[PDB]
Amino acid sequence: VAQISPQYPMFTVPLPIPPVKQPRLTVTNPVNGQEIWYYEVEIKPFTHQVYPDLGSADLVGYDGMSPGPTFQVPRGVETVVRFINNAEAPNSVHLHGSFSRAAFDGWAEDITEPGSFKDYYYPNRQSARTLWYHDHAMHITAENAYRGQAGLYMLTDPAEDALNLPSGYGEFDIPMILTSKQYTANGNLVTTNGELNSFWGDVIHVNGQPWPFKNVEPRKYRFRFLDAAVSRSFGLYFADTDAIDTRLPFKVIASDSGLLEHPADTSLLYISMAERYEVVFDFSDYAGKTIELRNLGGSIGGIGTDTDYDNTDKVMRFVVADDTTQPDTSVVPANLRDVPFPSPTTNTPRQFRFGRTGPTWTINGVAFADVQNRLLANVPVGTVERWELINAGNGATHPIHIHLVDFKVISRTSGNNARTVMPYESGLKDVVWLGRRETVVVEAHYAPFPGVYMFHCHNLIHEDHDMMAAFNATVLPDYGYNATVFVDPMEELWQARPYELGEFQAQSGQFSVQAVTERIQTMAEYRPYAAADE
Ligand SMILES: *[C@@H]1O[C@H](CO)[C@@H](O[C@@H]2O[C@H](CO)[C@@H](O[C@@H]3O[C@H](CO)[C@@H](O)[C@H](O)[C@@H]3O)[C@H](O)[C@H]2NC(C)=O)[C@H](O)[C@H]1NC(C)=O
Ligand SMILES: *[C@@H]1O[C@H](CO)[C@@H](O[C@@H]2O[C@H](CO)[C@@H](O[C@@H]3O[C@H](CO)[C@@H](O)[C@H](O)[C@@H]3O)[C@H](O)[C@H]2NC(C)=O)[C@H](O)[C@H]1NC(C)=O
Ligand SMILES: [Cu+2]
Ligand SMILES: [Cu+2]
Ligand SMILES: [Cu+2]
Ligand SMILES: [Cu+2]
Ligand SMILES: [K+]
Ligand code: NA
């Protein structure tokens, strides 16, 4: 249907690459003698000139940019991030893909008010993967994410680096953060506020830029796809502009939780909100050609319900040079890793129905606001469970996300006989797309940390109104590991604290080296991640 947003100069602006975020300090952990990397991120308003001949757009971002800066963290290095609210509305930061403790996970009620900060303590122990950090504040997640609060967080491993995949952040390893928004006649954003169905957007962005281009050499690139959109799901394919409907082969090498067992040879990649897939595309057969990254129409080929607009079939263009300036020393091995699948279970699956209760998006008829009814499962730590995730309806779709865990996709059924499990769903995931009339069974090890955690649809409009619930990963009273201060996301020890902007700017008072060192060393003495030690 007709584009609503003003006409944009398609494929004229280079793909931006978010800068790498550097830590301010390293603090010695008195428990293990190891360095903890400490970072400061300032959430603040800013403007950006999106449309060259109109006015600017009003954004609110991590470090006053969108996307937020990219984290690059080696496995085995703990991190503390001080997220400072210098904005207009509350925030709650979630590191999506991290088995963080409950009070460091972005629980939707665990908010930071403007004029406060919160210290988040992250483990960085899981398999190498593409994580992302984003806002999660109750009922305002869609607008906070839409206006800029999302960024990438790469967890690295020298063992994965030994596979010799295309490498170098911004060189041959390229972030591909997808969003879908709508602009006013004078080039500002159309707010998501008021939307209760879905906010599709008619302008496709990569790394915050509408319909960009990038100059590439005729060789292999690693692309890290993230769907950070409010409500748009995608069916991605590549085509030569000389044959714009002919899909070009590529390889999927990783899903939400890390590498697949083997690369999946693919010409069409379904990707829904909060999913990450890493692709290697080989431009060597396309020297001197322009390759367009495109998006399926027909509501993602009948899997979705999304509205399609005049230019939502287009993502970006790659302009391929005639030769390389350096040899392509990269490869995609046929064997990537032994995926650490959970033990199979015989426990009858738990059922969760994603639908509506009057106008509200619900789980088993419950809204997250309903404190009394929203705790839908008690799961003893160490248990494996199958969850049967049911979309009975034809009128919407739901990418379901479970915090804490990685899971195996066991099965997909479709009431439209449309598809089953996709080859790139063969590994470990933390989001799974329930297309029209789809039921998916997932299998997860509820481990290794006890606490109250969220699960929800990741369509941010559904999520806010109000399709989210909780589970409790439970332990007995003789379980140790300081569990009594780590199970409750609202535990007073880990709450947000007020700050004065002068002290932040001067790096004085509670931002002094001495004050930060004492705070982080005190936090480290509680040993939040010890139950994951190997
Ligand atoms: C989620 O699960 C955790 C358990 O993994 C629940 O925490 C446990 O709650 C019980 C009952 O409140 C606590 O036992 C109580 O201890 C107090 C203090 O000694 C005592 O006065 C009571 O008679 C009772 O024995 C237990 O200590 C606590 N465990 C931990 C590790 O903190 C938690 O309540 C569940 N959360 C929700 C929201 O249901
Ligand atoms: C659970 O969390 C508590 C509280 O953070 C941990 O207890 C703390 O353990 C630290 C060691 O990191 C104790 O510090 C000690 O200070 C004394 C001097 O006062 C010094 O001689 C020792 O060498 C050490 O530095 C700290 O006092 C202690 N605090 C309390 C209130 O007990 C505890 O280890 C954690 N337990 C687990 C199972 O994680
Ligand atoms: Cu998320
Ligand atoms: Cu998450
Ligand atoms: Cu949904
Ligand atoms: Cu969540
Ligand atoms: K140090
Ligand atoms: Na595979």
JSON list of N, CA, C and O in Angstrom, two decimals, residues 410-442:
[
{"chain": "A", "resi": 410, "resn": "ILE", "atom": "N", "xyz": [11.98, -27.90, 18.87]},
{"chain": "A", "resi": 410, "resn": "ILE", "atom": "CA", "xyz": [11.67, -29.34, 18.65]},
{"chain": "A", "resi": 410, "resn": "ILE", "atom": "C", "xyz": [10.76, -29.49, 17.43]},
{"chain": "A", "resi": 410, "resn": "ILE", "atom": "O", "xyz": [10.97, -30.41, 16.62]},
{"chain": "A", "resi": 411, "resn": "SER", "atom": "N", "xyz": [9.75, -28.64, 17.32]},
{"chain": "A", "resi": 411, "resn": "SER", "atom": "CA", "xyz": [8.67, -28.84, 16.32]},
{"chain": "A", "resi": 411, "resn": "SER", "atom": "C", "xyz": [7.98, -27.53, 16.01]},
{"chain": "A", "resi": 411, "resn": "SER", "atom": "O", "xyz": [7.87, -26.65, 16.93]},
{"chain": "A", "resi": 412, "resn": "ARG", "atom": "N", "xyz": [7.47, -27.43, 14.78]},
{"chain": "A", "resi": 412, "resn": "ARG", "atom": "CA", "xyz": [6.51, -26.38, 14.41]},
{"chain": "A", "resi": 412, "resn": "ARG", "atom": "C", "xyz": [5.37, -27.03, 13.63]},
{"chain": "A", "resi": 412, "resn": "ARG", "atom": "O", "xyz": [5.66, -27.74, 12.64]},
{"chain": "A", "resi": 413, "resn": "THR", "atom": "N", "xyz": [4.14, -26.75, 14.03]},
{"chain": "A", "resi": 413, "resn": "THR", "atom": "CA", "xyz": [2.96, -27.06, 13.20]},
{"chain": "A", "resi": 413, "resn": "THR", "atom": "C", "xyz": [2.33, -25.74, 12.74]},
{"chain": "A", "resi": 413, "resn": "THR", "atom": "O", "xyz": [2.47, -24.69, 13.44]},
{"chain": "A", "resi": 414, "resn": "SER", "atom": "N", "xyz": [1.65, -25.78, 11.60]},
{"chain": "A", "resi": 414, "resn": "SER", "atom": "CA", "xyz": [1.00, -24.61, 11.00]},
{"chain": "A", "resi": 414, "resn": "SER", "atom": "C", "xyz": [-0.43, -25.00, 10.66]},
{"chain": "A", "resi": 414, "resn": "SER", "atom": "O", "xyz": [-0.58, -25.94, 9.84]},
{"chain": "A", "resi": 415, "resn": "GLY", "atom": "N", "xyz": [-1.42, -24.27, 11.17]},
{"chain": "A", "resi": 415, "resn": "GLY", "atom": "CA", "xyz": [-2.84, -24.46, 10.77]},
{"chain": "A", "resi": 415, "resn": "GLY", "atom": "C", "xyz": [-3.06, -24.05, 9.33]},
{"chain": "A", "resi": 415, "resn": "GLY", "atom": "O", "xyz": [-4.17, -24.29, 8.82]},
{"chain": "A", "resi": 416, "resn": "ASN", "atom": "N", "xyz": [-2.10, -23.39, 8.67]},
{"chain": "A", "resi": 416, "resn": "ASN", "atom": "CA", "xyz": [-2.16, -23.09, 7.21]},
{"chain": "A", "resi": 416, "resn": "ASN", "atom": "C", "xyz": [-1.23, -24.04, 6.43]},
{"chain": "A", "resi": 416, "resn": "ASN", "atom": "O", "xyz": [-0.98, -23.78, 5.24]},
{"chain": "A", "resi": 417, "resn": "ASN", "atom": "N", "xyz": [-0.71, -25.09, 7.04]},
{"chain": "A", "resi": 417, "resn": "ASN", "atom": "CA", "xyz": [0.18, -26.07, 6.37]},
{"chain": "A", "resi": 417, "resn": "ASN", "atom": "C", "xyz": [1.35, -25.31, 5.71]},
{"chain": "A", "resi": 417, "resn": "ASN", "atom": "O", "xyz": [1.75, -25.69, 4.59]},
{"chain": "A", "resi": 418, "resn": "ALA", "atom": "N", "xyz": [1.88, -24.22, 6.30]},
{"chain": "A", "resi": 418, "resn": "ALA", "atom": "CA", "xyz": [2.80, -23.30, 5.58]},
{"chain": "A", "resi": 418, "resn": "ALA", "atom": "C", "xyz": [4.26, -23.78, 5.67]},
{"chain": "A", "resi": 418, "resn": "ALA", "atom": "O", "xyz": [4.99, -23.57, 4.68]},
{"chain": "A", "resi": 419, "resn": "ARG", "atom": "N", "xyz": [4.69, -24.28, 6.82]},
{"chain": "A", "resi": 419, "resn": "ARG", "atom": "CA", "xyz": [6.11, -24.60, 7.09]},
{"chain": "A", "resi": 419, "resn": "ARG", "atom": "C", "xyz": [6.23, -25.42, 8.37]},
{"chain": "A", "resi": 419, "resn": "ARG", "atom": "O", "xyz": [5.27, -25.45, 9.18]},
{"chain": "A", "resi": 420, "resn": "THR", "atom": "N", "xyz": [7.42, -26.01, 8.57]},
{"chain": "A", "resi": 420, "resn": "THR", "atom": "CA", "xyz": [7.77, -26.68, 9.83]},
{"chain": "A", "resi": 420, "resn": "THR", "atom": "C", "xyz": [9.03, -26.00, 10.39]},
{"chain": "A", "resi": 420, "resn": "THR", "atom": "O", "xyz": [9.09, -24.76, 10.31]},
{"chain": "A", "resi": 421, "resn": "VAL", "atom": "N", "xyz": [9.98, -26.74, 10.94]},
{"chain": "A", "resi": 421, "resn": "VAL", "atom": "CA", "xyz": [11.21, -26.13, 11.51]},
{"chain": "A", "resi": 421, "resn": "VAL", "atom": "C", "xyz": [12.16, -25.77, 10.35]},
{"chain": "A", "resi": 421, "resn": "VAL", "atom": "O", "xyz": [12.34, -26.59, 9.45]},
{"chain": "A", "resi": 422, "resn": "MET", "atom": "N", "xyz": [12.76, -24.59, 10.38]},
{"chain": "A", "resi": 422, "resn": "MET", "atom": "CA", "xyz": [13.66, -24.10, 9.33]},
{"chain": "A", "resi": 422, "resn": "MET", "atom": "C", "xyz": [15.08, -24.63, 9.59]},
{"chain": "A", "resi": 422, "resn": "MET", "atom": "O", "xyz": [15.48, -24.93, 10.73]},
{"chain": "A", "resi": 423, "resn": "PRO", "atom": "N", "xyz": [15.89, -24.82, 8.54]},
{"chain": "A", "resi": 423, "resn": "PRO", "atom": "CA", "xyz": [17.25, -25.34, 8.74]},
{"chain": "A", "resi": 423, "resn": "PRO", "atom": "C", "xyz": [18.12, -24.49, 9.68]},
{"chain": "A", "resi": 423, "resn": "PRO", "atom": "O", "xyz": [18.97, -25.02, 10.40]},
{"chain": "A", "resi": 424, "resn": "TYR", "atom": "N", "xyz": [17.90, -23.16, 9.66]},
{"chain": "A", "resi": 424, "resn": "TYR", "atom": "CA", "xyz": [18.65, -22.22, 10.51]},
{"chain": "A", "resi": 424, "resn": "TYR", "atom": "C", "xyz": [18.07, -22.17, 11.92]},
{"chain": "A", "resi": 424, "resn": "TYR", "atom": "O", "xyz": [18.66, -21.45, 12.77]},
{"chain": "A", "resi": 425, "resn": "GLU", "atom": "N", "xyz": [17.05, -22.96, 12.23]},
{"chain": "A", "resi": 425, "resn": "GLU", "atom": "CA", "xyz": [16.52, -23.15, 13.61]},
{"chain": "A", "resi": 425, "resn": "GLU", "atom": "C", "xyz": [17.06, -24.46, 14.20]},
{"chain": "A", "resi": 425, "resn": "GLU", "atom": "O", "xyz": [16.51, -24.90, 15.21]},
{"chain": "A", "resi": 426, "resn": "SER", "atom": "N", "xyz": [18.08, -25.08, 13.61]},
{"chain": "A", "resi": 426, "resn": "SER", "atom": "CA", "xyz": [18.65, -26.40, 14.00]},
{"chain": "A", "resi": 426, "resn": "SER", "atom": "C", "xyz": [19.48, -26.34, 15.29]},
{"chain": "A", "resi": 426, "resn": "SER", "atom": "O", "xyz": [19.81, -27.42, 15.80]},
{"chain": "A", "resi": 427, "resn": "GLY", "atom": "N", "xyz": [19.90, -25.15, 15.70]},
{"chain": "A", "resi": 427, "resn": "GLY", "atom": "CA", "xyz": [20.85, -24.96, 16.81]},
{"chain": "A", "resi": 427, "resn": "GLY", "atom": "C", "xyz": [20.16, -24.53, 18.07]},
{"chain": "A", "resi": 427, "resn": "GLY", "atom": "O", "xyz": [19.15, -25.16, 18.49]},
{"chain": "A", "resi": 428, "resn": "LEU", "atom": "N", "xyz": [20.68, -23.48, 18.70]},
{"chain": "A", "resi": 428, "resn": "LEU", "atom": "CA", "xyz": [20.08, -22.95, 19.94]},
{"chain": "A", "resi": 428, "resn": "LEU", "atom": "C", "xyz": [19.62, -21.52, 19.71]},
{"chain": "A", "resi": 428, "resn": "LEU", "atom": "O", "xyz": [20.35, -20.67, 19.06]},
{"chain": "A", "resi": 429, "resn": "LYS", "atom": "N", "xyz": [18.44, -21.23, 20.24]},
{"chain": "A", "resi": 429, "resn": "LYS", "atom": "CA", "xyz": [17.76, -19.93, 20.05]},
{"chain": "A", "resi": 429, "resn": "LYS", "atom": "C", "xyz": [17.23, -19.42, 21.40]},
{"chain": "A", "resi": 429, "resn": "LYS", "atom": "O", "xyz": [17.19, -20.18, 22.40]},
{"chain": "A", "resi": 430, "resn": "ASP", "atom": "N", "xyz": [16.82, -18.16, 21.45]},
{"chain": "A", "resi": 430, "resn": "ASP", "atom": "CA", "xyz": [16.10, -17.62, 22.61]},
{"chain": "A", "resi": 430, "resn": "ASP", "atom": "C", "xyz": [14.83, -16.85, 22.19]},
{"chain": "A", "resi": 430, "resn": "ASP", "atom": "O", "xyz": [14.04, -16.47, 23.09]},
{"chain": "A", "resi": 431, "resn": "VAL", "atom": "N", "xyz": [14.58, -16.72, 20.89]},
{"chain": "A", "resi": 431, "resn": "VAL", "atom": "CA", "xyz": [13.29, -16.22, 20.34]},
{"chain": "A", "resi": 431, "resn": "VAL", "atom": "C", "xyz": [12.82, -17.23, 19.29]},
{"chain": "A", "resi": 431, "resn": "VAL", "atom": "O", "xyz": [13.69, -17.74, 18.55]},
{"chain": "A", "resi": 432, "resn": "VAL", "atom": "N", "xyz": [11.52, -17.48, 19.18]},
{"chain": "A", "resi": 432, "resn": "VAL", "atom": "CA", "xyz": [11.01, -18.33, 18.07]},
{"chain": "A", "resi": 432, "resn": "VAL", "atom": "C", "xyz": [9.71, -17.72, 17.54]},
{"chain": "A", "resi": 432, "resn": "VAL", "atom": "O", "xyz": [8.85, -17.32, 18.34]},
{"chain": "A", "resi": 433, "resn": "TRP", "atom": "N", "xyz": [9.59, -17.64, 16.21]},
{"chain": "A", "resi": 433, "resn": "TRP", "atom": "CA", "xyz": [8.45, -16.94, 15.57]},
{"chain": "A", "resi": 433, "resn": "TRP", "atom": "C", "xyz": [7.25, -17.87, 15.44]},
{"chain": "A", "resi": 433, "resn": "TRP", "atom": "O", "xyz": [7.33, -18.88, 14.68]},
{"chain": "A", "resi": 434, "resn": "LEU", "atom": "N", "xyz": [6.15, -17.54, 16.13]},
{"chain": "A", "resi": 434, "resn": "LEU", "atom": "CA", "xyz": [4.83, -18.18, 15.92]},
{"chain": "A", "resi": 434, "resn": "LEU", "atom": "C", "xyz": [4.12, -17.40, 14.82]},
{"chain": "A", "resi": 434, "resn": "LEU", "atom": "O", "xyz": [3.45, -16.39, 15.09]},
{"chain": "A", "resi": 435, "resn": "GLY", "atom": "N", "xyz": [4.27, -17.87, 13.57]},
{"chain": "A", "resi": 435, "resn": "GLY", "atom": "CA", "xyz": [3.52, -17.33, 12.43]},
{"chain": "A", "resi": 435, "resn": "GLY", "atom": "C", "xyz": [2.04, -17.64, 12.54]},
{"chain": "A", "resi": 435, "resn": "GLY", "atom": "O", "xyz": [1.60, -18.20, 13.54]},
{"chain": "A", "resi": 436, "resn": "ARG", "atom": "N", "xyz": [1.28, -17.29, 11.51]},
{"chain": "A", "resi": 436, "resn": "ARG", "atom": "CA", "xyz": [-0.18, -17.48, 11.53]},
{"chain": "A", "resi": 436, "resn": "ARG", "atom": "C", "xyz": [-0.50, -18.92, 11.88]},
{"chain": "A", "resi": 436, "resn": "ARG", "atom": "O", "xyz": [0.01, -19.91, 11.22]},
{"chain": "A", "resi": 437, "resn": "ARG", "atom": "N", "xyz": [-1.36, -19.12, 12.89]},
{"chain": "A", "resi": 437, "resn": "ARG", "atom": "CA", "xyz": [-1.83, -20.45, 13.30]},
{"chain": "A", "resi": 437, "resn": "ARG", "atom": "C", "xyz": [-0.69, -21.44, 13.57]},
{"chain": "A", "resi": 437, "resn": "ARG", "atom": "O", "xyz": [-0.84, -22.67, 13.37]},
{"chain": "A", "resi": 438, "resn": "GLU", "atom": "N", "xyz": [0.44, -20.97, 14.11]},
{"chain": "A", "resi": 438, "resn": "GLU", "atom": "CA", "xyz": [1.60, -21.84, 14.39]},
{"chain": "A", "resi": 438, "resn": "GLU", "atom": "C", "xyz": [1.71, -22.21, 15.86]},
{"chain": "A", "resi": 438, "resn": "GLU", "atom": "O", "xyz": [1.44, -21.34, 16.75]},
{"chain": "A", "resi": 439, "resn": "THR", "atom": "N", "xyz": [2.07, -23.48, 16.11]},
{"chain": "A", "resi": 439, "resn": "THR", "atom": "CA", "xyz": [2.45, -23.96, 17.47]},
{"chain": "A", "resi": 439, "resn": "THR", "atom": "C", "xyz": [3.87, -24.47, 17.40]},
{"chain": "A", "resi": 439, "resn": "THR", "atom": "O", "xyz": [4.18, -25.26, 16.48]},
{"chain": "A", "resi": 440, "resn": "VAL", "atom": "N", "xyz": [4.73, -24.03, 18.33]},
{"chain": "A", "resi": 440, "resn": "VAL", "atom": "CA", "xyz": [6.15, -24.44, 18.39]},
{"chain": "A", "resi": 440, "resn": "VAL", "atom": "C", "xyz": [6.39, -25.03, 19.76]},
{"chain": "A", "resi": 440, "resn": "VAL", "atom": "O", "xyz": [6.00, -24.38, 20.77]},
{"chain": "A", "resi": 441, "resn": "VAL", "atom": "N", "xyz": [7.07, -26.17, 19.78]},
{"chain": "A", "resi": 441, "resn": "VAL", "atom": "CA", "xyz": [7.58, -26.76, 21.04]},
{"chain": "A", "resi": 441, "resn": "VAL", "atom": "C", "xyz": [9.07, -26.46, 21.13]},
{"chain": "A", "resi": 441, "resn": "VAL", "atom": "O", "xyz": [9.81, -26.74, 20.17]},
{"chain": "A", "resi": 442, "resn": "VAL", "atom": "N", "xyz": [9.47, -25.85, 22.25]},
{"chain": "A", "resi": 442, "resn": "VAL", "atom": "CA", "xyz": [10.90, -25.60, 22.56]},
{"chain": "A", "resi": 442, "resn": "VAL", "atom": "C", "xyz": [11.30, -26.46, 23.76]},
{"chain": "A", "resi": 442, "resn": "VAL", "atom": "O", "xyz": [10.44, -26.73, 24.61]}
]
